[PDB]
RNA sequence: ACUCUGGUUUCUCUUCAGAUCGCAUAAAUCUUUCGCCUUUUACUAAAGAUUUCCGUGGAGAGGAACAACUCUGAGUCUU
């Protein structure tokens, strides 16, 4: 989904400052979903590796 | 310048509260709008409606201190 959106617009992303917040929020939601899958209690300093 | 006029304080009970009950100020629940959002229990902060709580006034009632004289106005108040 992300590559589809970013390779469709490719220029309209930078000016849409709301889209950047939306994208990072969605990425955080996905990472939180994975972290909750790993363990019910959320981590404090989960790594990006 | 006169006779009668009956106190104040305090402890409880029962109710009504308009009023800054309160020249002070919390919490809970619910309903919406949000901010975190990841699940309640806690929350972000504005609104609306409620509940509880800390206190309050007025009135009535019942005991105690009070022990009552008299304050006091009523008046023919007097030379």
UniProtKB/Swiss-Prot annotation:
Cell compartments where the protein resides: Nucleus; Nucleus speckle
The source's superkingdom equals: Eukaryota
Tissue expression from the record: Widely expressed.
Relate the assembly described in the record: Part of the U5 snRNP complex. Component of the U4/U6-U5 tri-snRNP complex composed of the U4, U6 and U5 snRNAs and at least PRPF3, PRPF4, PRPF6, PRPF8, PRPF31, SNRNP200, TXNL4A, SNRNP40, DDX23, CD2BP2, PPIH, SNU13, EFTUD2, SART1 and USP39. Component of the U5.U4atac/U6atac snRNP complexes in U12-dependent spliceosomes. Within the minor spliceosome, which acts on U12-type introns, interacts with PPIL2 and RBM48. Core component of U2-type precatalytic, catalytic and postcatalytic spliceosomal complexes. Found in a mRNA splicing-dependent exon junction complex (EJC) with SRRM1.
Q: What is known of its domains?
A: The MPN (JAB/Mov34) domain mediates interaction with TSSC4 and SNRNP200. Has structural similarity with deubiquitinating enzymes, but lacks the residues that would bind the catalytic metal ion.
- Annotated disease: Retinitis pigmentosa 13: A retinal dystrophy belonging to the group of pigmentary retinopathies. Retinitis pigmentosa is characterized by retinal pigment deposits visible on fundus examination and primary loss of rod photoreceptor cells followed by secondary loss of cone photoreceptors. Patients typically have night vision blindness and loss of midperipheral visual field. As their condition progresses, they lose their far peripheral visual field and eventually central vision as well.
Give a short account of what the protein does. Answer: Plays a role in pre-mRNA splicing as core component of precatalytic, catalytic and postcatalytic spliceosomal complexes, both of the predominant U2-type spliceosome and the minor U12-type spliceosome. Functions as a scaffold that mediates the ordered assembly of spliceosomal proteins and snRNAs. Required for the assembly of the U4/U6-U5 tri-snRNP complex, a building block of the spliceosome. Functions as a scaffold that positions spliceosomal U2, U5 and U6 snRNAs at splice sites on pre-mRNA substrates, so that splicing can occur. Interacts with both the 5' and the 3' splice site.
What name goes with this protein?
Pre-mRNA-processing-splicing factor 8
Q: Which organism is it from?
A: Homo sapiens
Q: Which residues of the full protein are shown?
A: 1266 to 1314 of 2335
């Amino acid at each position: 989904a992300l590559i589809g959106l970013m390779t469709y617009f490719r220029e309209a992303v930078v000016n849409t400052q709301e889209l950047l917040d939306l994208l990072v929020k969605c990425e955080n939601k996905i990472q939180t979903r994975i972290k909750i899958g790993l363990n019910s209690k959320m981590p404090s300093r989960f790594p990006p590796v």
